Amino acid sequence: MNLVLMGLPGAGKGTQAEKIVEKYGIPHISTGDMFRAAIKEGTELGLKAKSFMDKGELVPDEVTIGIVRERLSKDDCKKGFLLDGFPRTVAQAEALDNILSELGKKLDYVINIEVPKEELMERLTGRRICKTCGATYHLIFNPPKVEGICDKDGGELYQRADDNPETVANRLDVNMKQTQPLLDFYEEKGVLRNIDGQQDINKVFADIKALLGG
Ligand SMILES: Nc1ncnc2c1ncn2[C@@H]1O[C@H](COP(=O)(O)OP(=O)(O)OP(=O)(O)OP(=O)(O)OP(=O)(O)OC[C@H]2O[C@@H](n3cnc4c(N)ncnc43)[C@H](O)[C@@H]2O)[C@@H](O)[C@H]1O
Ligand SMILES: [Mg+2]
Ligand SMILES: [Zn+2]
């Protein structure tokens, strides 16, 4: 299965991706995670991405396409993959078609997880992440059992740099501008599948399972 997860910032893509890889054993390819890892390596690519990410802007198309092309070329993507947060512009979507054509592959589904803007703001500002294992919580919808600490080790929880209200506002504006173009692109292809992301995490996943069952 060759899959894209699409959704506005905070819509639950990582949450659902983790459940998809656990069930189906395909690799999770998240451009955001890749940029954050590059930032940690301290690479020139990483540091250039950081300037956009800190402002809630999209990293420019050409560099983003390049890391995706390289990642999809690996042996672990031969039997399927899960792209998460790529593509983010129509130019990226067109590039992906070319990347896949070169590999002799086709997208099966673009799974678009729909949540309203006001809810997404709170998804992000209420997000807390474990410093020591990267487990994700939400102060309202998925709280840790003990305030301020991770359930699975005892690690301190932190707030992603870009989850501050100012940056979240810009993230939402930037990606909302790109949304109708992307939706139309994939509707034309007949591969867009919309999922109601305003449900219990497991009910979202149940809807995705029903789709992937076909
Ligand atoms: N292709 C590209 N081109 C250019 N630039 C790019 C790029 N890709 C990345 N970038 C750059 O990198 C930056 C970051 O990328 P971005 O795509 O923002 O990073 P991300 O971590 O992949 O995605 P989000 O942080 O938006 O969250 P999510 O949808 O994964 O939600 P989550 O499951 O964590 O859940 C969020 C919260 O909600 C909670 N939650 C999840 N599901 C539910 C539910 N069903 N009900 C209630 N709460 C829930 C969680 O507990 C959590 O607290 C971009 O701004 C840009 O600069
Ligand atoms: Mg994510
Ligand atoms: Zn932890």
PDB file of all heavy atoms in Angstrom, residues 4 61-62 64-66 68-69 72 83 86-102 105 107 110 178 181-186 188-189 191:
ATOM      1  N   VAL A   4      -0.522   8.404   1.425  1.00  0.00           N
ATOM      2  CA  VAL A   4      -0.243   9.736   1.949  1.00  0.00           C
ATOM      3  C   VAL A   4      -1.269  10.023   3.047  1.00  0.00           C
ATOM      4  O   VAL A   4      -2.468   9.799   2.848  1.00  0.00           O
ATOM      5  CB  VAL A   4      -0.355  10.821   0.854  1.00  0.00           C
ATOM      6  CG1 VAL A   4      -0.413  12.245   1.431  1.00  0.00           C
ATOM      7  CG2 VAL A   4       0.796  10.679  -0.163  1.00  0.00           C
ATOM      8  N   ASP A  61       9.974  24.118  -1.695  1.00  0.00           N
ATOM      9  CA  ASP A  61       9.612  22.866  -2.365  1.00  0.00           C
ATOM     10  C   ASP A  61      10.810  21.991  -2.795  1.00  0.00           C
ATOM     11  O   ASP A  61      10.826  20.769  -2.556  1.00  0.00           O
ATOM     12  CB  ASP A  61       8.724  23.128  -3.579  1.00  0.00           C
ATOM     13  CG  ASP A  61       7.324  23.567  -3.237  1.00  0.00           C
ATOM     14  OD1 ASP A  61       6.759  23.169  -2.187  1.00  0.00           O
ATOM     15  OD2 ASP A  61       6.773  24.305  -4.076  1.00  0.00           O
ATOM     16  N   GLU A  62      11.820  22.606  -3.413  1.00  0.00           N
ATOM     17  CA  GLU A  62      12.855  21.803  -4.063  1.00  0.00           C
ATOM     18  C   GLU A  62      13.635  20.966  -3.045  1.00  0.00           C
ATOM     19  O   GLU A  62      13.809  19.748  -3.224  1.00  0.00           O
ATOM     20  CB  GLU A  62      13.790  22.657  -4.905  1.00  0.00           C
ATOM     21  CG  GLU A  62      14.662  21.818  -5.821  1.00  0.00           C
ATOM     22  CD  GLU A  62      15.432  22.643  -6.824  1.00  0.00           C
ATOM     23  OE1 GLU A  62      15.766  23.819  -6.522  1.00  0.00           O
ATOM     24  OE2 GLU A  62      15.688  22.105  -7.935  1.00  0.00           O
ATOM     25  N   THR A  64      12.615  19.994  -0.120  1.00  0.00           N
ATOM     26  CA  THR A  64      11.707  19.037   0.493  1.00  0.00           C
ATOM     27  C   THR A  64      11.539  17.838  -0.419  1.00  0.00           C
ATOM     28  O   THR A  64      11.627  16.690   0.036  1.00  0.00           O
ATOM     29  CB  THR A  64      10.357  19.711   0.788  1.00  0.00           C
ATOM     30  OG1 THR A  64      10.588  20.889   1.570  1.00  0.00           O
ATOM     31  CG2 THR A  64       9.454  18.812   1.573  1.00  0.00           C
ATOM     32  N   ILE A  65      11.299  18.117  -1.699  1.00  0.00           N
ATOM     33  CA  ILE A  65      11.205  17.042  -2.751  1.00  0.00           C
ATOM     34  C   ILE A  65      12.444  16.142  -2.734  1.00  0.00           C
ATOM     35  O   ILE A  65      12.347  14.905  -2.829  1.00  0.00           O
ATOM     36  CB  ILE A  65      10.933  17.662  -4.132  1.00  0.00           C
ATOM     37  CG1 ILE A  65       9.556  18.327  -4.158  1.00  0.00           C
ATOM     38  CG2 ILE A  65      11.059  16.629  -5.244  1.00  0.00           C
ATOM     39  CD1 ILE A  65       9.304  19.314  -5.259  1.00  0.00           C
ATOM     40  N   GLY A  66      13.613  16.765  -2.596  1.00  0.00           N
ATOM     41  CA  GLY A  66      14.867  16.056  -2.654  1.00  0.00           C
ATOM     42  C   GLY A  66      15.057  15.042  -1.550  1.00  0.00           C
ATOM     43  O   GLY A  66      15.459  13.931  -1.810  1.00  0.00           O
ATOM     44  N   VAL A  68      12.635  13.637   0.128  1.00  0.00           N
ATOM     45  CA  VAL A  68      11.607  12.618  -0.095  1.00  0.00           C
ATOM     46  C   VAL A  68      12.023  11.631  -1.212  1.00  0.00           C
ATOM     47  O   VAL A  68      11.908  10.417  -1.058  1.00  0.00           O
ATOM     48  CB  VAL A  68      10.223  13.268  -0.323  1.00  0.00           C
ATOM     49  CG1 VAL A  68       9.161  12.239  -0.702  1.00  0.00           C
ATOM     50  CG2 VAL A  68       9.794  13.994   0.958  1.00  0.00           C
ATOM     51  N   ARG A  69      12.510  12.152  -2.327  1.00  0.00           N
ATOM     52  CA  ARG A  69      13.000  11.292  -3.403  1.00  0.00           C
ATOM     53  C   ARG A  69      14.042  10.319  -2.866  1.00  0.00           C
ATOM     54  O   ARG A  69      13.966   9.113  -3.139  1.00  0.00           O
ATOM     55  CB  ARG A  69      13.569  12.103  -4.555  1.00  0.00           C
ATOM     56  CG  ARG A  69      14.178  11.230  -5.658  1.00  0.00           C
ATOM     57  CD  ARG A  69      15.007  12.011  -6.641  1.00  0.00           C
ATOM     58  NE  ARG A  69      14.221  12.980  -7.392  1.00  0.00           N
ATOM     59  CZ  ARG A  69      14.295  14.318  -7.249  1.00  0.00           C
ATOM     60  NH1 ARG A  69      15.122  14.885  -6.348  1.00  0.00           N
ATOM     61  NH2 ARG A  69      13.547  15.104  -8.025  1.00  0.00           N
ATOM     62  N   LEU A  72      12.396   7.630  -0.397  1.00  0.00           N
ATOM     63  CA  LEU A  72      11.563   6.645  -1.108  1.00  0.00           C
ATOM     64  C   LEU A  72      12.328   5.683  -1.972  1.00  0.00           C
ATOM     65  O   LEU A  72      11.778   4.640  -2.367  1.00  0.00           O
ATOM     66  CB  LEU A  72      10.487   7.337  -1.964  1.00  0.00           C
ATOM     67  CG  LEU A  72       9.393   8.032  -1.170  1.00  0.00           C
ATOM     68  CD1 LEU A  72       8.496   8.853  -2.062  1.00  0.00           C
ATOM     69  CD2 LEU A  72       8.551   7.001  -0.431  1.00  0.00           C
ATOM     70  N   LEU A  83       3.584   8.180   3.614  1.00  0.00           N
ATOM     71  CA  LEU A  83       4.035   9.579   3.632  1.00  0.00           C
ATOM     72  C   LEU A  83       3.114  10.367   4.570  1.00  0.00           C
ATOM     73  O   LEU A  83       1.913  10.189   4.546  1.00  0.00           O
ATOM     74  CB  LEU A  83       3.981  10.187   2.239  1.00  0.00           C
ATOM     75  CG  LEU A  83       5.113   9.799   1.308  1.00  0.00           C
ATOM     76  CD1 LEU A  83       4.675  10.153  -0.107  1.00  0.00           C
ATOM     77  CD2 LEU A  83       6.417  10.499   1.683  1.00  0.00           C
ATOM     78  N   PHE A  86       3.622  15.138   3.556  1.00  0.00           N
ATOM     79  CA  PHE A  86       4.125  15.440   2.221  1.00  0.00           C
ATOM     80  C   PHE A  86       3.163  14.741   1.264  1.00  0.00           C
ATOM     81  O   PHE A  86       2.899  13.576   1.497  1.00  0.00           O
ATOM     82  CB  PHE A  86       5.544  14.915   2.061  1.00  0.00           C
ATOM     83  CG  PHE A  86       6.145  15.163   0.674  1.00  0.00           C
ATOM     84  CD1 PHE A  86       6.968  16.253   0.432  1.00  0.00           C
ATOM     85  CD2 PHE A  86       5.832  14.338  -0.406  1.00  0.00           C
ATOM     86  CE1 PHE A  86       7.473  16.491  -0.842  1.00  0.00           C
ATOM     87  CE2 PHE A  86       6.353  14.571  -1.669  1.00  0.00           C
ATOM     88  CZ  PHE A  86       7.164  15.658  -1.885  1.00  0.00           C
ATOM     89  N   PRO A  87       2.654  15.377   0.208  1.00  0.00           N
ATOM     90  CA  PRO A  87       2.989  16.753  -0.206  1.00  0.00           C
ATOM     91  C   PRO A  87       2.194  17.787   0.535  1.00  0.00           C
ATOM     92  O   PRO A  87       1.128  17.501   1.094  1.00  0.00           O
ATOM     93  CB  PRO A  87       2.545  16.799  -1.664  1.00  0.00           C
ATOM     94  CG  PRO A  87       1.368  15.833  -1.689  1.00  0.00           C
ATOM     95  CD  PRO A  87       1.781  14.719  -0.769  1.00  0.00           C
ATOM     96  N   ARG A  88       2.710  19.008   0.497  1.00  0.00           N
ATOM     97  CA  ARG A  88       2.086  20.196   1.137  1.00  0.00           C
ATOM     98  C   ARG A  88       1.750  21.297   0.170  1.00  0.00           C
ATOM     99  O   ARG A  88       1.138  22.269   0.551  1.00  0.00           O
ATOM    100  CB  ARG A  88       2.973  20.760   2.233  1.00  0.00           C
ATOM    101  CG  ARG A  88       3.274  19.777   3.334  1.00  0.00           C
ATOM    102  CD  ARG A  88       2.041  19.498   4.200  1.00  0.00           C
ATOM    103  NE  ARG A  88       1.899  20.344   5.386  1.00  0.00           N
ATOM    104  CZ  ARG A  88       2.454  20.103   6.578  1.00  0.00           C
ATOM    105  NH1 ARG A  88       3.271  19.073   6.807  1.00  0.00           N
ATOM    106  NH2 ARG A  88       2.156  20.916   7.577  1.00  0.00           N
ATOM    107  N   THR A  89       2.206  21.159  -1.080  1.00  0.00           N
ATOM    108  CA  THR A  89       1.859  22.066  -2.159  1.00  0.00           C
ATOM    109  C   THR A  89       1.583  21.241  -3.401  1.00  0.00           C
ATOM    110  O   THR A  89       1.999  20.088  -3.492  1.00  0.00           O
ATOM    111  CB  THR A  89       3.019  23.042  -2.485  1.00  0.00           C
ATOM    112  OG1 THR A  89       4.157  22.301  -2.971  1.00  0.00           O
ATOM    113  CG2 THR A  89       3.403  23.839  -1.259  1.00  0.00           C
ATOM    114  N   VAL A  90       0.876  21.832  -4.343  1.00  0.00           N
ATOM    115  CA  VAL A  90       0.623  21.142  -5.628  1.00  0.00           C
ATOM    116  C   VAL A  90       1.958  20.805  -6.350  1.00  0.00           C
ATOM    117  O   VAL A  90       2.111  19.728  -6.953  1.00  0.00           O
ATOM    118  CB  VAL A  90      -0.380  21.897  -6.531  1.00  0.00           C
ATOM    119  CG1 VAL A  90      -0.483  21.257  -7.933  1.00  0.00           C
ATOM    120  CG2 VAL A  90      -1.749  21.895  -5.862  1.00  0.00           C
ATOM    121  N   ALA A  91       2.941  21.692  -6.268  1.00  0.00           N
ATOM    122  CA  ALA A  91       4.248  21.414  -6.892  1.00  0.00           C
ATOM    123  C   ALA A  91       4.890  20.154  -6.280  1.00  0.00           C
ATOM    124  O   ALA A  91       5.381  19.257  -6.996  1.00  0.00           O
ATOM    125  CB  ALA A  91       5.172  22.623  -6.719  1.00  0.00           C
ATOM    126  N   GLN A  92       4.810  20.015  -4.955  1.00  0.00           N
ATOM    127  CA  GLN A  92       5.240  18.773  -4.305  1.00  0.00           C
ATOM    128  C   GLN A  92       4.433  17.545  -4.769  1.00  0.00           C
ATOM    129  O   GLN A  92       4.986  16.463  -4.914  1.00  0.00           O
ATOM    130  CB  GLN A  92       5.181  18.886  -2.779  1.00  0.00           C
ATOM    131  CG  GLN A  92       6.215  19.860  -2.218  1.00  0.00           C
ATOM    132  CD  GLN A  92       6.175  20.079  -0.711  1.00  0.00           C
ATOM    133  OE1 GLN A  92       6.709  21.094  -0.179  1.00  0.00           O
ATOM    134  NE2 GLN A  92       5.581  19.159   0.001  1.00  0.00           N
ATOM    135  N   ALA A  93       3.132  17.713  -4.960  1.00  0.00           N
ATOM    136  CA  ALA A  93       2.281  16.585  -5.390  1.00  0.00           C
ATOM    137  C   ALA A  93       2.665  16.136  -6.798  1.00  0.00           C
ATOM    138  O   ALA A  93       2.712  14.936  -7.083  1.00  0.00           O
ATOM    139  CB  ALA A  93       0.811  16.969  -5.323  1.00  0.00           C
ATOM    140  N   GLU A  94       2.915  17.106  -7.681  1.00  0.00           N
ATOM    141  CA  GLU A  94       3.370  16.797  -9.048  1.00  0.00           C
ATOM    142  C   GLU A  94       4.720  16.116  -9.016  1.00  0.00           C
ATOM    143  O   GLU A  94       4.919  15.144  -9.716  1.00  0.00           O
ATOM    144  CB  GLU A  94       3.353  18.041  -9.917  1.00  0.00           C
ATOM    145  CG  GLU A  94       1.975  18.564 -10.206  1.00  0.00           C
ATOM    146  CD  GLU A  94       1.921  19.714 -11.182  1.00  0.00           C
ATOM    147  OE1 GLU A  94       2.874  19.928 -11.955  1.00  0.00           O
ATOM    148  OE2 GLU A  94       0.897  20.403 -11.220  1.00  0.00           O
ATOM    149  N   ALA A  95       5.633  16.584  -8.172  1.00  0.00           N
ATOM    150  CA  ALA A  95       6.930  15.937  -7.993  1.00  0.00           C
ATOM    151  C   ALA A  95       6.835  14.503  -7.504  1.00  0.00           C
ATOM    152  O   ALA A  95       7.548  13.607  -7.974  1.00  0.00           O
ATOM    153  CB  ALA A  95       7.828  16.755  -7.074  1.00  0.00           C
ATOM    154  N   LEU A  96       5.940  14.274  -6.564  1.00  0.00           N
ATOM    155  CA  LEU A  96       5.723  12.954  -6.058  1.00  0.00           C
ATOM    156  C   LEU A  96       5.263  12.027  -7.178  1.00  0.00           C
ATOM    157  O   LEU A  96       5.691  10.868  -7.221  1.00  0.00           O
ATOM    158  CB  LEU A  96       4.649  13.005  -4.971  1.00  0.00           C
ATOM    159  CG  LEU A  96       4.367  11.637  -4.325  1.00  0.00           C
ATOM    160  CD1 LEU A  96       5.601  10.979  -3.737  1.00  0.00           C
ATOM    161  CD2 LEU A  96       3.291  11.815  -3.270  1.00  0.00           C
ATOM    162  N   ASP A  97       4.380  12.502  -8.055  1.00  0.00           N
ATOM    163  CA  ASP A  97       3.926  11.639  -9.185  1.00  0.00           C
ATOM    164  C   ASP A  97       5.141  11.208  -9.989  1.00  0.00           C
ATOM    165  O   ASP A  97       5.229  10.061 -10.403  1.00  0.00           O
ATOM    166  CB  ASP A  97       2.968  12.368 -10.104  1.00  0.00           C
ATOM    167  CG  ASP A  97       1.552  12.403  -9.583  1.00  0.00           C
ATOM    168  OD1 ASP A  97       1.143  11.589  -8.691  1.00  0.00           O
ATOM    169  OD2 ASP A  97       0.806  13.235 -10.115  1.00  0.00           O
ATOM    170  N   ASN A  98       6.059  12.138 -10.246  1.00  0.00           N
ATOM    171  CA  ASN A  98       7.276  11.817 -11.006  1.00  0.00           C
ATOM    172  C   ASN A  98       8.173  10.850 -10.249  1.00  0.00           C
ATOM    173  O   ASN A  98       8.707   9.926 -10.822  1.00  0.00           O
ATOM    174  CB  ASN A  98       8.080  13.083 -11.290  1.00  0.00           C
ATOM    175  CG  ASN A  98       7.402  14.035 -12.254  1.00  0.00           C
ATOM    176  OD1 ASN A  98       6.461  13.703 -12.953  1.00  0.00           O
ATOM    177  ND2 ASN A  98       7.937  15.260 -12.308  1.00  0.00           N
ATOM    178  N   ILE A  99       8.385  11.094  -8.961  1.00  0.00           N
ATOM    179  CA  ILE A  99       9.169  10.189  -8.128  1.00  0.00           C
ATOM    180  C   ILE A  99       8.583   8.770  -8.177  1.00  0.00           C
ATOM    181  O   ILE A  99       9.292   7.798  -8.360  1.00  0.00           O
ATOM    182  CB  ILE A  99       9.233  10.709  -6.692  1.00  0.00           C
ATOM    183  CG1 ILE A  99      10.087  11.979  -6.662  1.00  0.00           C
ATOM    184  CG2 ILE A  99       9.753   9.660  -5.705  1.00  0.00           C
ATOM    185  CD1 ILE A  99       9.898  12.803  -5.389  1.00  0.00           C
ATOM    186  N   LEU A 100       7.273   8.661  -8.009  1.00  0.00           N
ATOM    187  CA  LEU A 100       6.633   7.356  -8.031  1.00  0.00           C
ATOM    188  C   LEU A 100       6.698   6.693  -9.404  1.00  0.00           C
ATOM    189  O   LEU A 100       6.957   5.468  -9.501  1.00  0.00           O
ATOM    190  CB  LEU A 100       5.216   7.444  -7.500  1.00  0.00           C
ATOM    191  CG  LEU A 100       5.147   7.863  -6.037  1.00  0.00           C
ATOM    192  CD1 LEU A 100       3.681   7.874  -5.604  1.00  0.00           C
ATOM    193  CD2 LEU A 100       6.006   7.008  -5.120  1.00  0.00           C
ATOM    194  N   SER A 101       6.474   7.470 -10.459  1.00  0.00           N
ATOM    195  CA  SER A 101       6.601   6.946 -11.828  1.00  0.00           C
ATOM    196  C   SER A 101       7.986   6.369 -12.061  1.00  0.00           C
ATOM    197  O   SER A 101       8.124   5.278 -12.674  1.00  0.00           O
ATOM    198  CB  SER A 101       6.290   8.017 -12.873  1.00  0.00           C
ATOM    199  OG  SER A 101       4.896   8.260 -12.930  1.00  0.00           O
ATOM    200  N   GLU A 102       9.017   7.071 -11.575  1.00  0.00           N
ATOM    201  CA  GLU A 102      10.405   6.578 -11.728  1.00  0.00           C
ATOM    202  C   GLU A 102      10.615   5.214 -11.009  1.00  0.00           C
ATOM    203  O   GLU A 102      11.326   4.330 -11.510  1.00  0.00           O
ATOM    204  CB  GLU A 102      11.422   7.647 -11.266  1.00  0.00           C
ATOM    205  CG  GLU A 102      12.901   7.239 -11.282  1.00  0.00           C
ATOM    206  CD  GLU A 102      13.410   6.878 -12.668  1.00  0.00           C
ATOM    207  OE1 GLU A 102      12.720   7.202 -13.676  1.00  0.00           O
ATOM    208  OE2 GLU A 102      14.524   6.287 -12.768  1.00  0.00           O
ATOM    209  N   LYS A 105       5.694   2.918  -9.361  1.00  0.00           N
ATOM    210  CA  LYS A 105       4.635   2.858  -8.349  1.00  0.00           C
ATOM    211  C   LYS A 105       3.528   3.878  -8.599  1.00  0.00           C
ATOM    212  O   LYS A 105       3.723   4.878  -9.318  1.00  0.00           O
ATOM    213  CB  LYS A 105       5.228   3.094  -6.962  1.00  0.00           C
ATOM    214  CG  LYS A 105       6.096   1.969  -6.468  1.00  0.00           C
ATOM    215  CD  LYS A 105       6.601   2.219  -5.056  1.00  0.00           C
ATOM    216  CE  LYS A 105       6.355   1.036  -4.120  1.00  0.00           C
ATOM    217  NZ  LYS A 105       7.129  -0.149  -4.598  1.00  0.00           N
ATOM    218  N   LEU A 107       0.257   5.883  -6.235  1.00  0.00           N
ATOM    219  CA  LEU A 107      -0.429   6.116  -4.977  1.00  0.00           C
ATOM    220  C   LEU A 107      -1.706   5.357  -4.972  1.00  0.00           C
ATOM    221  O   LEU A 107      -2.425   5.363  -5.966  1.00  0.00           O
ATOM    222  CB  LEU A 107      -0.804   7.584  -4.767  1.00  0.00           C
ATOM    223  CG  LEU A 107       0.274   8.512  -4.285  1.00  0.00           C
ATOM    224  CD1 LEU A 107      -0.376   9.873  -4.065  1.00  0.00           C
ATOM    225  CD2 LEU A 107       0.963   7.996  -3.026  1.00  0.00           C
ATOM    226  N   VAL A 110      -4.766   9.039  -0.794  1.00  0.00           N
ATOM    227  CA  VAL A 110      -4.394  10.217  -0.022  1.00  0.00           C
ATOM    228  C   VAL A 110      -5.517  10.377   1.019  1.00  0.00           C
ATOM    229  O   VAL A 110      -6.645  10.707   0.684  1.00  0.00           O
ATOM    230  CB  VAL A 110      -4.269  11.468  -0.904  1.00  0.00           C
ATOM    231  CG1 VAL A 110      -4.049  12.719  -0.091  1.00  0.00           C
ATOM    232  CG2 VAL A 110      -3.117  11.331  -1.905  1.00  0.00           C
ATOM    233  N   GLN A 178      -2.880  26.317   1.119  1.00  0.00           N
ATOM    234  CA  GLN A 178      -2.534  25.199   0.205  1.00  0.00           C
ATOM    235  C   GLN A 178      -3.597  24.096   0.110  1.00  0.00           C
ATOM    236  O   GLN A 178      -3.486  23.190  -0.740  1.00  0.00           O
ATOM    237  CB  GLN A 178      -1.219  24.518   0.643  1.00  0.00           C
ATOM    238  CG  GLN A 178      -0.002  25.419   0.691  1.00  0.00           C
ATOM    239  CD  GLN A 178       0.253  26.038  -0.630  1.00  0.00           C
ATOM    240  OE1 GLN A 178       0.146  25.373  -1.652  1.00  0.00           O
ATOM    241  NE2 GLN A 178       0.592  27.300  -0.631  1.00  0.00           N
ATOM    242  N   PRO A 181      -6.156  23.702  -3.161  1.00  0.00           N
ATOM    243  CA  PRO A 181      -5.389  23.169  -4.299  1.00  0.00           C
ATOM    244  C   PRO A 181      -5.013  21.693  -4.212  1.00  0.00           C
ATOM    245  O   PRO A 181      -5.151  20.970  -5.206  1.00  0.00           O
ATOM    246  CB  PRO A 181      -4.151  24.101  -4.385  1.00  0.00           C
ATOM    247  CG  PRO A 181      -4.654  25.334  -3.782  1.00  0.00           C
ATOM    248  CD  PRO A 181      -5.589  24.963  -2.680  1.00  0.00           C
ATOM    249  N   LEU A 182      -4.543  21.246  -3.063  1.00  0.00           N
ATOM    250  CA  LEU A 182      -4.201  19.844  -2.879  1.00  0.00           C
ATOM    251  C   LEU A 182      -5.388  18.931  -2.960  1.00  0.00           C
ATOM    252  O   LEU A 182      -5.297  17.858  -3.571  1.00  0.00           O
ATOM    253  CB  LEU A 182      -3.560  19.602  -1.538  1.00  0.00           C
ATOM    254  CG  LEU A 182      -2.147  20.058  -1.380  1.00  0.00           C
ATOM    255  CD1 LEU A 182      -1.824  20.051   0.108  1.00  0.00           C
ATOM    256  CD2 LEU A 182      -1.162  19.182  -2.182  1.00  0.00           C
ATOM    257  N   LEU A 183      -6.496  19.315  -2.320  1.00  0.00           N
ATOM    258  CA  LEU A 183      -7.689  18.501  -2.361  1.00  0.00           C
ATOM    259  C   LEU A 183      -8.141  18.322  -3.798  1.00  0.00           C
ATOM    260  O   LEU A 183      -8.437  17.183  -4.226  1.00  0.00           O
ATOM    261  CB  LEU A 183      -8.808  19.136  -1.530  1.00  0.00           C
ATOM    262  CG  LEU A 183      -8.574  19.187  -0.030  1.00  0.00           C
ATOM    263  CD1 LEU A 183      -9.776  19.869   0.626  1.00  0.00           C
ATOM    264  CD2 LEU A 183      -8.347  17.806   0.577  1.00  0.00           C
ATOM    265  N   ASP A 184      -8.204  19.400  -4.571  1.00  0.00           N
ATOM    266  CA  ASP A 184      -8.612  19.317  -5.996  1.00  0.00           C
ATOM    267  C   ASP A 184      -7.660  18.448  -6.795  1.00  0.00           C
ATOM    268  O   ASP A 184      -8.119  17.626  -7.591  1.00  0.00           O
ATOM    269  CB  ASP A 184      -8.782  20.694  -6.655  1.00  0.00           C
ATOM    270  CG  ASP A 184     -10.246  21.101  -6.784  1.00  0.00           C
ATOM    271  OD1 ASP A 184     -10.976  20.434  -7.545  1.00  0.00           O
ATOM    272  OD2 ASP A 184     -10.696  22.073  -6.145  1.00  0.00           O
ATOM    273  N   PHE A 185      -6.359  18.585  -6.574  1.00  0.00           N
ATOM    274  CA  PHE A 185      -5.391  17.754  -7.275  1.00  0.00           C
ATOM    275  C   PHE A 185      -5.664  16.263  -7.092  1.00  0.00           C
ATOM    276  O   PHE A 185      -5.706  15.502  -8.069  1.00  0.00           O
ATOM    277  CB  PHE A 185      -3.953  18.114  -6.825  1.00  0.00           C
ATOM    278  CG  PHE A 185      -2.887  17.371  -7.553  1.00  0.00           C
ATOM    279  CD1 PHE A 185      -2.365  17.893  -8.736  1.00  0.00           C
ATOM    280  CD2 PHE A 185      -2.342  16.213  -7.034  1.00  0.00           C
ATOM    281  CE1 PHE A 185      -1.353  17.211  -9.434  1.00  0.00           C
ATOM    282  CE2 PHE A 185      -1.361  15.505  -7.750  1.00  0.00           C
ATOM    283  CZ  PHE A 185      -0.842  16.025  -8.927  1.00  0.00           C
ATOM    284  N   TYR A 186      -5.865  15.833  -5.854  1.00  0.00           N
ATOM    285  CA  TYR A 186      -6.075  14.424  -5.582  1.00  0.00           C
ATOM    286  C   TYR A 186      -7.491  13.972  -5.849  1.00  0.00           C
ATOM    287  O   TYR A 186      -7.680  12.768  -6.175  1.00  0.00           O
ATOM    288  CB  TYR A 186      -5.573  14.036  -4.195  1.00  0.00           C
ATOM    289  CG  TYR A 186      -4.054  14.012  -4.138  1.00  0.00           C
ATOM    290  CD1 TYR A 186      -3.344  14.822  -3.263  1.00  0.00           C
ATOM    291  CD2 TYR A 186      -3.325  13.162  -5.002  1.00  0.00           C
ATOM    292  CE1 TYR A 186      -1.965  14.776  -3.223  1.00  0.00           C
ATOM    293  CE2 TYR A 186      -1.948  13.106  -4.952  1.00  0.00           C
ATOM    294  CZ  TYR A 186      -1.275  13.913  -4.046  1.00  0.00           C
ATOM    295  OH  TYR A 186       0.105  13.875  -3.988  1.00  0.00           O
ATOM    296  N   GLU A 188      -9.183  14.923  -8.494  1.00  0.00           N
ATOM    297  CA  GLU A 188      -9.076  14.712  -9.937  1.00  0.00           C
ATOM    298  C   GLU A 188      -8.515  13.307 -10.204  1.00  0.00           C
ATOM    299  O   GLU A 188      -8.962  12.613 -11.118  1.00  0.00           O
ATOM    300  CB  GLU A 188      -8.188  15.798 -10.585  1.00  0.00           C
ATOM    301  CG  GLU A 188      -7.846  15.699 -12.091  1.00  0.00           C
ATOM    302  CD  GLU A 188      -9.051  15.716 -13.032  1.00  0.00           C
ATOM    303  OE1 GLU A 188     -10.072  16.323 -12.626  1.00  0.00           O
ATOM    304  OE2 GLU A 188      -8.984  15.124 -14.179  1.00  0.00           O
ATOM    305  N   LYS A 189      -7.543  12.897  -9.390  1.00  0.00           N
ATOM    306  CA  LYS A 189      -6.895  11.580  -9.532  1.00  0.00           C
ATOM    307  C   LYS A 189      -7.795  10.442  -9.057  1.00  0.00           C
ATOM    308  O   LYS A 189      -7.570   9.250  -9.388  1.00  0.00           O
ATOM    309  CB  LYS A 189      -5.592  11.518  -8.744  1.00  0.00           C
ATOM    310  CG  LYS A 189      -4.362  11.949  -9.474  1.00  0.00           C
ATOM    311  CD  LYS A 189      -3.160  11.717  -8.558  1.00  0.00           C
ATOM    312  CE  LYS A 189      -1.818  11.967  -9.165  1.00  0.00           C
ATOM    313  NZ  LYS A 189      -1.854  12.689 -10.451  1.00  0.00           N
ATOM    314  N   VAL A 191      -8.133   9.563  -5.863  1.00  0.00           N
ATOM    315  CA  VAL A 191      -7.467   8.879  -4.770  1.00  0.00           C
ATOM    316  C   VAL A 191      -7.677   9.545  -3.406  1.00  0.00           C
ATOM    317  O   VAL A 191      -7.218   8.995  -2.389  1.00  0.00           O
ATOM    318  CB  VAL A 191      -5.944   8.717  -4.999  1.00  0.00           C
ATOM    319  CG1 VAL A 191      -5.678   7.842  -6.223  1.00  0.00           C
ATOM    320  CG2 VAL A 191      -5.216  10.051  -5.111  1.00  0.00           C
TER     321      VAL A 191
END
